[PDB]
Design a protein around this ligand. Structure first.
Ligand SMILES: Nc1ncnc2c1ncn2[C@@H]1O[C@H](CSCC[C@H](N)C(=O)O)[C@@H](O)[C@H]1O
Ligand SMILES: Nc1ncnc2c1ncn2[C@@H]1O[C@H](CSCC[C@H](N)C(=O)O)[C@@H](O)[C@H]1O
Ligand SMILES: N[C@@H](Cc1c[nH]c2ccccc12)C(=O)O
Ligand SMILES: N[C@@H](Cc1c[nH]c2ccccc12)C(=O)O
Ligand code: SF4
Ligand code: SF4
Ligand SMILES: [Br-]
Ligand SMILES: [Br-]
Ligand SMILES: [Br-]
Ligand SMILES: [Br-]
Ligand SMILES: [Br-]
Ligand SMILES: [Br-]
Ligand code: NA
Ligand code: NA
Lengths: 384, 384
């Protein structure tokens, strides 16, 4: 019943049998005869199909999706963490980080800034992941409170990204919300390759919570078992060298979730500068656009999430592939009325490339011709 | 500015100079010429004054206090703990304990049972004490929420007992309440003797949070610095062999708090059966009544707290010395409408002697002629 990692050799064999040109010729709303993972791999490896042509096909295939875009802004509620992810500044061993924690007042103030000054109706709550059961339950409780508070304020969509979750931890968070509430669980697997995963997230049975690959990857299944709906798997582009392996796994994971009746967003964030203990792979724009294209094409009902990790120039090229645009900063309580968000190296998870205010970024997107759901431009008669 | 432990040799010298008979002859509202600690020690050591006669004097001296009694019922919100107190079942090393955690729903349900079925308007929230800063802040956040929730429900007095507190942890809890709210910080020093303290609470600098004697003992001063008012120091009777030492220290601590403008309750709980890793001293009823008497006499504006650690027969004899009566159970979410509270050895901090419902105990006290503030007997027209 839980997600099972696909056999990469089995998918490769199936991918050899798909007609990539026939696939591209499919009408919007038509599904290939082969599995999505196989089709994605075949499109990826068929270099006779240009990335530019693949991207155009993807944007066309996802064209009828409504709304075209919606948005949420991240709010890191703390930068404490018990884990040791080597590509992340929040790793416990990073003694150089200035550890911060948002209380009731600060979280509420941040929500109110986002709602009224940035004009957004989507928010995401983030924390580190913690080792001992009590801290995990207490974190779930606090984030559950934040989610409930955001919804009561009028936020129309709430994401959370607080590490893997077991059944009792979901129980604690769930007492704050209803089964039909617009709440999305985010748990990026980072890498579906167990060896690369261990290299960056560490070895198990030593008080490093995220090292447990299996607890993490079945978190969505526990979520769905509890009766919820919205999920957000992800791959961190730059960890594993073989992107074809990761796209097969991610598409397979999304496909599993879809089969369970889940609504899934798909995240493929690319690496950003941080206080790392191990360097990573720089993935070029072309490979990355090709990755986004095959995933978006093969999973047309599952929105890709694009964030301000990426510079303005890249957003301009890739926005057509996304279903969710998410501007913001991975610093703790970084927002302030009329000011750009803080992205201090001393306390942030990583350094983002685009620090322009969410309402400017989202305003320019709307001005360019694409409406953004869960964004209410604080302009004209809608201004205070 | 912070509390300084009195020199026991200096107090002993002063106690030798007080006229214990003249002290007993003092009118109610009149204060001895010597310090309270010295007077308490002298009364304690003057065996020509019987315990029975000392108790009568204490009950008389505290007789004009209004209200005579008020009440609160404890609610343990979790039995997780990071510390290692050797006389407590909740010590981290006790692997036999069934660890529990109350979420939003359970805490609220417990509050509603206490309010409506037991008819109480006072509640206390308790947790273990935790090591890492994030867990401490998260615990402070959750308990702050509970306190705010209780007050909103109509509770007129709220205690909390969640371990030592630093300035930032108080900040987090404080965002839930106002400076004038009826909220009492409880931090029982257990023993003011540093050696006995180390024997039971453990040695410092090894991830055992309560081992830090000094952080614990100045928690009230941080509370008062933040602008709050109500405090509750305590001694665990049975740890230190020399009760005269502990009563000098406790009375001195209460006196310090009083000088800062604080309103203080005084707790002298006696040891109860638990899953201990070190046995303790059994203190007889006479010594214990004498202890309560000299503390109550010398600190007439500071209410002693009497709890259902003690059996019914002892409450009957000692109730006249108390200003706070606190029935309940030290199990996690133990209350249930129409049923006696749970005190399961598998999950409780210790075993209490009196498990009768709070409303029965408090009802019998009122029937006997003593009103209990913050108790509304759910009877007659006040019943649903
Ligand atoms: N250096 C970096 N650059 C860009 N993204 C990063 C990054 N380090 C981590 N991330 C991404 O940020 C995402 C959410 S922040 C992590 C939340 C939570 N502690 C968890 O690990 O589940 C992670 O899933 C990871 O993919
Ligand atoms: N075995 C036992 N019998 C009776 N009281 C006990 C006990 N063990 C601990 N206690 C008391 O219960 C009180 C509150 S429960 C402890 C709360 C918090 N973890 C803290 O230690 O500060 C403690 O202060 C202690 O004095
Ligand atoms: N890193 C999280 C939260 C997030 C959303 N948008 C962002 C922009 C910048 C930094 C972090 C974010 C995610 O990708 O879901
Ligand atoms: N032990 C805490 C809480 C408490 C109040 N009344 C009790 C009765 C039984 C057990 C615990 C309690 C205290 O003495 O303040
Ligand atoms: S990715 Fe998440 S779990 Fe890993 S170190 Fe960073 S905050 Fe902690
Ligand atoms: S007395 Fe408090 S701090 Fe000590 S073990 Fe028990 S719950 Fe933990
Ligand atoms: Br649209
Ligand atoms: Br990088
Ligand atoms: Br909206
Ligand atoms: Br009275
Ligand atoms: Br005992
Ligand atoms: Br009342
Ligand atoms: Na909009
Ligand atoms: Na009453």
């Amino acid at each position: 019943g839980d997600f099972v990692l696909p056999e990469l050799e089995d998918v490769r064999a199936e991918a050899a049998t798909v007609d990539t040109r026939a696939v591209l010729a499919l009408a919007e709303g038509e599904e290939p005869a082969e599995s999505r993972a196989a089709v994605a791999l075949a499109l990826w490896e068929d270099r006779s199909i240009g990335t530019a042509e693949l991207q155009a096909a993807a944007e066309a295939r996802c064209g009828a999706r409504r709304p075209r875009l919606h948005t949420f802004v991240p709010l890191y509620t703390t930068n404490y963490c018990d884990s040791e992810c080597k590509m992340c500044s929040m790793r416990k061993g990073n003694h150089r980080l200035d550890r911060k924690f948002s209380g009731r007042k600060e979280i509420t103030e941040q929500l109110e800034i986002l709602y009224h000054h940035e004009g957004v109706r989507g928010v995401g709550f983030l924390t580190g992941e913690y080792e001992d059961k009590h801290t995990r339950l207490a974190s779930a409780f606090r984030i559950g409170w934040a989610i409930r508070t955001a919804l009561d304020l009028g936020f129309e969509r709430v994401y959370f990204n607080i590490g893997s979750m077991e059944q009792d931890e979901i129980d604690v968070l769930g007492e704050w919300i209803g089964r039909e509430d617009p709440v999305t669980m985010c748990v990026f697997q980072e890498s579906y390759d167990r060896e690369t995963y261990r290299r960056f997230m560490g070895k198990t049975s030593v008080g490093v919570p995220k090292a447990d690959f299996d607890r993490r990857v079945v978190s969505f299944d526990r979520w769905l078992d509890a009766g919820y709906r919205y999920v957000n798997p992800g791959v961190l582009v730059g960890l594993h060298d073989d992107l074809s392996a990761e796209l097969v796994s991610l598409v397979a994971h999304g496909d599993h979730l879809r089969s369970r009746g889940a609504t899934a967003d798909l995240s493929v964030p690319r690496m950003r500068p941080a206080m790392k203990s191990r360097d990573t792979t720089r993935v070029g724009d072309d490979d990355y656009l090709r990755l986004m294209s095959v995933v978006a094409f093969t999973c047309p009902e599952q929105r890709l999430v694009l964030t301000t990790r990426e510079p303005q120039e890249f957003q301009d090229v890739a926005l057509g592939l996304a279903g969710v645009i998410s501007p913001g900063s991975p610093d703790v309580a970084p927002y302030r009325a009329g000011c750009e968000a803080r992205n201090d190296e001393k306390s942030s998870q990583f350094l983002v490339a685009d620090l322009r205010r969410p309402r400017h970024i989202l305003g320019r997107i709307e001005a360019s011709g694409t409406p953004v759901d869960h964004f209410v431009n604080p302009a004209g008669e809608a201004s205070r």
